[PDB]
Symmetry: D2
Subunit: 21 residues, 4 copies
Amino acid sequence: SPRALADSLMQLAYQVSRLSS
Amino acid sequence: TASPRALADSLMQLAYQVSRLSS
Amino acid sequence: SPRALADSLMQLAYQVSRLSS
Amino acid sequence: ASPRALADSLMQLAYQVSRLSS
């Protein structure tokens, strides 16, 4: 579902924000 | 390659758009 | 890992492409 | 934006994410 995919993308966005260059 | 912060901000904005799609 | 997150994102991108406007 | 366009953008972002570091 769109909502399930959006939830997953939001979680991944926060994880990506904790990476480094 | 963009920064982690810029990529995360982009992903967040896309996630909000995805949520408005339909099955 | 960046690779694992990127692979997850690619899978999600493909699923998004199969959604409807 | 269309599902196709959003998917293209997400794919582009995934390629970039793969070049980041832990």
